[PDB]
């Protein structure tokens, strides 16, 4: 099934974005005075709460590239969760047509 295939592809891609985003955020934020997103472990946590939209506000990017990385994490997170929902819709719709006799 395509909907379950694209969903799985979205989840694995999300994990890649989370890891890479955690790596790129630190690389981008270091060098800017006052930045807190400068260590990998908490950067990964930041990526999670960002991708899930959430955004406690305990950690936030202050640089241009750190914020661009953030946007990518947001979109990847929203798209994946939106794709899972879309996949769940197809499963339920296809199932309802079966118990109806259509």
């Amino acid at each position, epitope marked *: 099934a395509l909907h379950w295939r694209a969903a799985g592809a979205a989840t694995v891609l999300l994990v890649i974005v989370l890891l890479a985003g955690s790596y790129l955020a630190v690389l981008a934020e270091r060098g800017a*005075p006052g930045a807190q997103l400068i*260590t990998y472990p908490r950067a990964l946590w930041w990526a999670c709460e960002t991708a899930t939209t959430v955004x406690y506000g305990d950690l936030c990017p202050v640089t241009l590239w750190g914020r661009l990385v953030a946007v990518v994490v947001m979109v990847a997170g929203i798209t994946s969760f939106g794709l899972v929902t879309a996949a769940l819709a197809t499963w339920f719709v296809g199932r309802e047509q079966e118990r109806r006799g259509h």
Partner: antibody
Amino acid sequence: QVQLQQPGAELVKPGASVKLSCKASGYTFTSDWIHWVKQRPGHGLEWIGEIIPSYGRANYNEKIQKKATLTADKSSSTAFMQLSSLTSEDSAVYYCARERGDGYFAVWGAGTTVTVSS
Amino acid sequence: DILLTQSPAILSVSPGERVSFSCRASQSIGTDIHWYQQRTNGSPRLLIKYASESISGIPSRFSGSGSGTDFTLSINSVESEDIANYYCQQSNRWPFTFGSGTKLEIKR
């Protein structure tokens, strides 16, 4: 084994330049940052700058004079600090340290005693 | 940038007595503070990471505490080998900064 190997000493004439080395061993991750710390005789530790060998990007302490230039060689796992236009103020022991990207300096080098004199 | 204040600069104490080093940050840094030990003509050595976490190889004599602004490095019953300079370092905000340092002296 010694994780960070630095030269014992470096003699530099006033105005000249010097390229300190920091050969690294042990475990090496792409998340590793190499830092450099300056310590003048009778003074405390002073952060100079940092560099990530896996990407090559370096940051410097902008609170002090820009004397250093950080480069790295991923082939030999050795970090370098280019000090130029040295005066008597730059005469100190320069340590290099490894950070696993988690904030603390796990291991330090023996330190290179740089003396600026004619 | 974050200023780390270590007072007093020199700390005198009798042998076999508990001692405490102070480190105060100019801003709230949670528990992102790290302690180092530097003996005469030696390189700095990590004693405590993240305020209170212990380090492999370091005697259980050393301990750490504190959060936010005030932090403390403690030594239960000091020994002669503890004679050194003690520095604190923060990793909460860029750039990383060190404290002025505290010298430990033993009154034998």
